[PDB]
Amino acid sequence: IVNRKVEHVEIAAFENVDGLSSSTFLNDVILVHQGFPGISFSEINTKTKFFRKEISVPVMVTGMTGGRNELGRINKIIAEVAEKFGIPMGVGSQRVAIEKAEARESFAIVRKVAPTIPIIANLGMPQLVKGYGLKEFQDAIQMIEADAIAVHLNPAQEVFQPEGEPEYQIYALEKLRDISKELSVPIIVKESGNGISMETAKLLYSYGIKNFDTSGQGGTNWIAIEMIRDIRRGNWKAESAKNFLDWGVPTAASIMEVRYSVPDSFLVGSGGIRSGLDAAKAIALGADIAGMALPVLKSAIEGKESLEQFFRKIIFELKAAMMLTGSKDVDALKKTSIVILGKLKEWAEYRGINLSIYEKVRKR
Amino acid sequence: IVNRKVEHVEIAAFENVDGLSSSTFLNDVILVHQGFPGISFSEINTKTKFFRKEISVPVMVTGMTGGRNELGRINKIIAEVAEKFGIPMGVGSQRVAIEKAEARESFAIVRKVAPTIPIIANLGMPQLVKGYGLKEFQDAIQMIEADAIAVHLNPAQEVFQPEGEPEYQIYALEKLRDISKELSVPIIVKESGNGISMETAKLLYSYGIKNFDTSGQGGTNWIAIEMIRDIRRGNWKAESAKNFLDWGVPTAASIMEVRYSVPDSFLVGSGGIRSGLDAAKAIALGADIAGMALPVLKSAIEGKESLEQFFRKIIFELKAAMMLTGSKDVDALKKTSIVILGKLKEWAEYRGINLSIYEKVRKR
Amino acid sequence: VNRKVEHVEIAAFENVDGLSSSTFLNDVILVHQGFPGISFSEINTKTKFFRKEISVPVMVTGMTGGRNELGRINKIIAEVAEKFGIPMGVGSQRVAIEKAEARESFAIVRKVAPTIPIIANLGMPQLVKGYGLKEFQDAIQMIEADAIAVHLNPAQEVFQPEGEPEYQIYALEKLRDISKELSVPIIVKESGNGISMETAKLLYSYGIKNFDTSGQGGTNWIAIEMIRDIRRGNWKAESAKNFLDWGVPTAASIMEVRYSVPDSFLVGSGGIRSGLDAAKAIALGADIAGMALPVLKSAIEGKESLEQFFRKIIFELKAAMMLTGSKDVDALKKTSIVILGKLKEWAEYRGINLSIYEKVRKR
Amino acid sequence: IVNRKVEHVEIAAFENVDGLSSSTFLNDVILVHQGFPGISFSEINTKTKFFRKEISVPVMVTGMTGGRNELGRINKIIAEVAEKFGIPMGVGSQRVAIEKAEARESFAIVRKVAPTIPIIANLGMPQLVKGYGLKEFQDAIQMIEADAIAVHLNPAQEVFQPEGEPEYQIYALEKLRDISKELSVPIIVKESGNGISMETAKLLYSYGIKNFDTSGQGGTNWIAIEMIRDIRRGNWKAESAKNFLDWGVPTAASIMEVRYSVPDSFLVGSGGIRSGLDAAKAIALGADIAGMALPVLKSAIEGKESLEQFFRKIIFELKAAMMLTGSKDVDALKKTSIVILGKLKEWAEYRGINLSIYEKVRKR
Numbered sequence A, B, D: 001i002v003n004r005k006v007e008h009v010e011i012a013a014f015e016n017v018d019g020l021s022s023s024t025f026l027n028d029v030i031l032v033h034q035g036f037p038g039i040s041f042s043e044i045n046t047k048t049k050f051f052r053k054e055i056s057v058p059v060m061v062t063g064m065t066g067g068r069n070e071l072g073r074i075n076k077i078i079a080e081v082a083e084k085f086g087i088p089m090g091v092g093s094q095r096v097a098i099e100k101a102e103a104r105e106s107f108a109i110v111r112k113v114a115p116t117i118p119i120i121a122n123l124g125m126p127q128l129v130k131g132y133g134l135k136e137f138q139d140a141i142q143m144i145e146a147d148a149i150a151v152h153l154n155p156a157q158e159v160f161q162p163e164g165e166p167e168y169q170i171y172a173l174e175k176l177r178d179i180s181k182e183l184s185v186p187i188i189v190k191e192s193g194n195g196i197s198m199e200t201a202k203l204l205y206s207y208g209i210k211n212f213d214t215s216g217q218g219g220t221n222w223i224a225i226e227m228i229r230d231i232r233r234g235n236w237k238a239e240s241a242k243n244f245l246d247w248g249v250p251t252a253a254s255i256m257e258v259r260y261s262v263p264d265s266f267l268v269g270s271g272g273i274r275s276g277l278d279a280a281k282a283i284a285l286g287a288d289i290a291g292m293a294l295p296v297l298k299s300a301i302e303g304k305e306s307l308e309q310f311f312r313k314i315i316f317e318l319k320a321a322m323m324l325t326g327s328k329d330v331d332a333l334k335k336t337s338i339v340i341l342g343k344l345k346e347w348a349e350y351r352g353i354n355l356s357i358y359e360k361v362r363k364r
Numbered sequence C: 001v002n003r004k005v006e007h008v009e010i011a012a013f014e015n016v017d018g019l020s021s022s023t024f025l026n027d028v029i030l031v032h033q034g035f036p037g038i039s040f041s042e043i044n045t046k047t048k049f050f051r052k053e054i055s056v057p058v059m060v061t062g063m064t065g066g067r068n069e070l071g072r073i074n075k076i077i078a079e080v081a082e083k084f085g086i087p088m089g090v091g092s093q094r095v096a097i098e099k100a101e102a103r104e105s106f107a108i109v110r111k112v113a114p115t116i117p118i119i120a121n122l123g124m125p126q127l128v129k130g131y132g133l134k135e136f137q138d139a140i141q142m143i144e145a146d147a148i149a150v151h152l153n154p155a156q157e158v159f160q161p162e163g164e165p166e167y168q169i170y171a172l173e174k175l176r177d178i179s180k181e182l183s184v185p186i187i188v189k190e191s192g193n194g195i196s197m198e199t200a201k202l203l204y205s206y207g208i209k210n211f212d213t214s215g216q217g218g219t220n221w222i223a224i225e226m227i228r229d230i231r232r233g234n235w236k237a238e239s240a241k242n243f244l245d246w247g248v249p250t251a252a253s254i255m256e257v258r259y260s261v262p263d264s265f266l267v268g269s270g271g272i273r274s275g276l277d278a279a280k281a282i283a284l285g286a287d288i289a290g291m292a293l294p295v296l297k298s299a300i301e302g303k304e305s306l307e308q309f310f311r312k313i314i315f316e317l318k319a320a321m322m323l324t325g326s327k328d329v330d331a332l333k334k335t336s337i338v339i340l341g342k343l344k345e346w347a348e349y350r351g352i353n354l355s356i357y358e359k360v361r362k363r
């Protein structure tokens, strides 16, 4: 399992798996340019709420890694930069540290170095059907003094991953619902590159889930990562993974689906957010914050100052989109004028997303 | 006419005629990803009914060959693997064996080696206007102890094939309707690479036909095969065949057309089914089972263990698609959520396929 | 005289067929019928062309004439058309109204094709330049024509180095008067840029009932004149280039004319290159399919080349009828189609109600 | 400073910034061909009104340059040819000449050499928030005896330009409105490559602005120009500019939006007008006149006779479109039949541009 954590980072960082045969549908979203913005750049306010805390920018780093010391040093760099910028940070799956106690430090370092920002713990849905419960959740949370815990959905990844098994019985949701009653922090349910649909969002909501992270297709392709792991071990599933490279809900469509089917959700729009303009689009479309993982990893590996430059660039690009839409603050961005075209439009139409009611929901 | 059988197999197996200038429209069908499936992979049930028998997977091998001993050995390999996997198998046109009695064994071997699975006999619609009747149908059936007989439509192929004629007078259907009253097994009407429209489906239904096999364009291109036979004999029809390479109803559209216009039909979706994902899409769209021919031929030529690996891959991919849509069984897959986009959408719209009533009919 | 030779040479040997243009015929699909309900041998391709019967619903539209080498091309086309029972238009006869030595290069057509419909040809601009009844009667008598086509070519005239585009309404007043005295009917045809519903309705309001779409996507006359311009260092060349995709695509023109004048007799032409294109043109609303350029190219190759060409067109037409369950031309006109993509958006923007369209193209 | 002025001309003239990663959407507009025009070429009348003057062609040169003598000599060439053709001419931003008095001659030369055509002064909207007022406007106007003054919107350019700031407080519009009461000539508000939306047009109209110049995306890409200036000085904003290369309202969409949202506006359609056919399309879509800048610059640099040939070509192409549309004059062109397809069609639909009421407004 420890080797898999390193192999994941190495394939994501150095192989060709970002947007491989997949699409966010964000090219189908246009933010309407305002030649008279009505504001000045210096007055743009990017602050927003993240549960009980305030954050500096409506962007987060979503969970990636942890489990060995070299992974901990990646976590350390991301956490210290995130703290500097006032940006929330999720950690990778903490399964490895619930088991092997030597793996705990590679997660705990995050809170040592980032005492103020929201920190989000991480466990997988399949562990709920395998005997994780309240205590494991509390241990994941306490380990980093987390402000929330993300529970990940990754059935696509599990199906193609060489080492077993995709298990998603409804009992897991009953358990999740029970756990949420005893926990002192909120639960976020996030996908892992394949996106959340309205049926999935409504099912989760019916069990008390109110916080969602789209992780749609078009960014890091987890089916591709497992495909590569399969190719590497001469596992025949590789050719089957290849047929599923474009499987999933595109990020842009997932954001629309979650916002429309659960209008009061707190929503992270993620999966292929690569610029402050993507982030601006995600928010205008209906997300409360934009999430990123892969490009943060790649910069962090390059080093601290590379990662600081990366965030400087994201933030500037976000502010430029706010400036050029006349959005003085995040709230104004959420209601700014957009155009939806092409395949995203056809997707919304077939799925019964009445654009008229969509407009009202995304902006009230 | 025996060596036409050989030439067909050789061109299909070794020339470039799969999907040549043609399209299934299956790229316009998306199965909606469910990040919380509600099931586990191991509980997925792929069993379904095929007339009076149960089959293990909702997939069949459609009719191809027979007529000489080398063709019989291909039939033998396919039949033994299909028996092993619990998959129905059609044989190729049995005309050759109604005439030449030496050709009978190359069909009969199928039932010797596959005693339990449904086996489907095969005769051509033109033979009905050329003097075939009850006795020839009963002989075709008895020869392999068939559980059904497929009657093929191939006017496109006949038009471009160097040797003779396209004959499809309505008298053939009168005869077919009479024969169906005396036969102890059901009749399936199948196309052969060019697809079944609603006009054709309704006409066949008005003569008592209830079982259809779409064989749409986008897979094996029979116009291309005959084009190649023409090029080879310096026949001028070759250039004309080239103008018709994209002629026919795409598989996806044919499935919609048959299901919509004959809502209670038993429906095989075929013509360019190349993965278990294609098979999942065909079923979700409205078929009861997915049919395949060419890729089974190519693998069978490679050998028994190649064909076994092929089916293992198809079945895995089908189950992956079911897993990732939350479909515990074939019935759930038939009603799972989809998106229809692009040209298939415009096709449906022009043809008056009301998507609202469409969604209703396919989900039953 | 020399323009006439240059036109044939550029059309035949330069790259001007469908150059930056489109028929929109790729947006039309004929619905395949796996049970046709007919046999190939019973397919009947006969149809009416005014007072005559023709063997196939296809015509050769007007191209050339004016010198003896052009007459020998006309002769080859006419003799093959006669053999196949196919109507033939000749090129503009202006040259032969003027120069009397040019008459034989047109007259040869009737000598060699005594039974098929033969269609005379004069340009609409000539009506504002003094041509009238007598010139029309001369063009007709010269080949014992069964009809006369009057061509519209303002686009060609705008970019052609030598002079002017003149289309005052007076021309139509004159045309209407002429039609009262003439013993054969008038067809109005374009020349590569298509007939719109505004143009069709205007012509209909002056008594014109016979149209030939000659839409964009086939022979590109703006391109031909662009080439003549490039050759003489004329600056208009670069401007012609900007207009290479100007005009109504053939498929859209057929829809527009059939829709806006439901009882018209309609030739669908401009980029018809196969019997499948011909089948589509007819299913879409034309009564017959016209061709020019590919007949020219084959004729230049020779008699037997042109015979093989027609054999191919006819087989391809019959294949589409077979595969559509169309026993005759009338059944083809009502066969099931799908319209997609840009043609669909064109019709929508133009207010072509598809529901009423279907009714009109069928009845 | 003043060499930013020369650097702009140099990059625009000699680098690849025309339509870079951007689009006018003019390919989605088709003028319907009329095979019987009902006119002759020689009777086509291209005259139209430009405020209190008559002009020979419905085309103008929009503002570009001025500030140094070499820039003045470009202005001189453009002005003398515009005078010869009866075409209105805008000058570039006159800020430089309000400040440095040595820069005045490079603007004044325009009126010396073009005594009769409309000449349009130019000042930036940002200068209104930076203390420019009535006197600066009157000085800009008097310096060239202007018949109007254009106030330019360029927040996109300012955001990416290395030297300083985007400031667009509503106070500027209050000031602009006050200034317009004291001015003896009308105000045009123009963009600068990124286009005017309906929200921006309605806001300006609410402050008394009735004259608009779209300057949509698809022509000169000002974000690209500044990107290049950034690349040249190793400024990190370069990579961010690259993410915004396709930002803005396309010219064709901007024409539709301004005509639709302010039906009585006097409207210049500009941003990527490169031929008389583009000019014809812009007018048929709803503009009163077509504007051009970059191609006029490029020809002017080549010299007087190159620029004369350029206009000869534009005018011929415009008349060809009028001829082939049966438009005897500019008024008939404004109501000629068109087709709108593709992305422009989807843009208008999403933005609630009812095509039925649209046709009425552009024709009346």
Ligand SMILES: C/C=C(\CCOP(=O)(O)OP(=O)(O)O)C[C@@]12Nc3cc(C)c(C)cc3N(C[C@H](O)[C@H](O)[C@H](O)COP(=O)(O)O)C1=NC(=O)NC2=O
Residues within 6 Å of the ligand: A001, A004, A005, A008, A009, A012, A062, A063, A064, A065, A091, A092, A093, A094, A095, A096, A122, A123, A124, A150, A151, A152, A153, A154, A157, A190, A191, A192, A193, A215, A216, A218, A219, A220, A222, A270, A271, A272, A273, A291, A292, A293, A294, A295, A297
């Ligand atoms: C499915 C992924 C997993 C589950 C672990 O599998 P198992 O080994 O079965 O876990 P175990 O059995 O419990 O040990 C790993 C994950 N770590 C992970 C590694 C790296 C390197 C990349 C790039 C991304 C993620 N993300 C997805 C990101 O958070 C984003 O949502 C996504 O990448 C889209 O954003 P984009 O990258 O900006 O386009 C993860 N998400 C998680 O929820 N948990 C994690 O641990």
Ligand SMILES: C/C=C(\CCOP(=O)(O)OP(=O)(O)O)C[C@@]12Nc3cc(C)c(C)cc3N(C[C@H](O)[C@H](O)[C@H](O)COP(=O)(O)O)C1=NC(=O)NC2=O
Residues within 6 Å of the ligand: B004, B008, B009, B012, B062, B063, B064, B065, B091, B092, B093, B094, B095, B096, B122, B123, B124, B150, B151, B152, B153, B154, B157, B190, B191, B192, B193, B215, B216, B218, B219, B220, B222, B270, B271, B272, B273, B291, B292, B293, B294, B295, B297
């Ligand atoms: C028209 C085709 C014929 C009729 C025989 O012609 P005639 O010689 O006139 O018969 P006669 O006069 O009676 O002697 C041959 C056929 N054999 C045949 C051979 C090979 C090698 C392949 C690949 C395809 C088929 N299929 C089509 C397949 O079953 C599928 O429908 C199709 O391939 C789409 O699925 P994909 O392959 O997955 O894309 C046949 N269909 C049949 O109904 N009968 C047959 O005998």
Ligand SMILES: C/C=C(\CCOP(=O)(O)OP(=O)(O)O)C[C@@]12Nc3cc(C)c(C)cc3N(C[C@H](O)[C@H](O)[C@H](O)COP(=O)(O)O)C1=NC(=O)NC2=O
Residues within 6 Å of the ligand: C003, C007, C008, C011, C061, C062, C063, C064, C090, C091, C092, C093, C094, C095, C121, C122, C123, C149, C150, C151, C152, C153, C156, C189, C190, C191, C192, C214, C215, C217, C218, C219, C221, C269, C270, C271, C272, C290, C291, C292, C293, C294, C296
């Ligand atoms: C505008 C064209 C003219 C007018 C002559 O110009 P002027 O010199 O002004 O004549 P004058 O001043 O009066 O002496 C020439 C034309 N001859 C002609 C030459 C060649 C070689 C080809 C290929 C095409 C045509 N066609 C168009 C064809 O009939 C078809 O409509 C068209 O080609 C689309 O079908 P596709 O080729 O199958 O794609 C003609 N159309 C005519 O009506 N008259 C003719 O004389």
Ligand SMILES: C/C=C(\CCOP(=O)(O)OP(=O)(O)O)C[C@@]12Nc3cc(C)c(C)cc3N(C[C@H](O)[C@H](O)[C@H](O)COP(=O)(O)O)C1=NC(=O)NC2=O
Residues within 6 Å of the ligand: D004, D005, D008, D009, D012, D062, D063, D064, D065, D091, D092, D093, D094, D095, D096, D122, D123, D124, D150, D151, D152, D153, D154, D157, D190, D191, D192, D193, D215, D216, D218, D219, D220, D222, D270, D271, D272, D273, D291, D292, D293, D294, D295, D297
């Ligand atoms: C925003 C533009 C500016 C601001 C100056 O920057 P600052 O230094 O901030 O100004 P300061 O601080 O006040 O000194 C420069 C501009 N000059 C200018 C230079 C050249 C060389 C080109 C090609 C074009 C423009 N245009 C836009 C053109 O008129 C067209 O609208 C546009 O090009 C689309 O039409 P297409 O070229 O046909 O595609 C100008 N527009 C203006 O309103 N003012 C000008 O000074």
Ligand SMILES: [Mg+2]
Residues within 6 Å of the ligand: A124, A126
């Ligand atoms: Mg896991």
Ligand SMILES: [Mg+2]
Residues within 6 Å of the ligand: B124, B126, B158
């Ligand atoms: Mg046969």
Ligand SMILES: [Mg+2]
Residues within 6 Å of the ligand: C092, C123, C125, C153
């Ligand atoms: Mg002429």
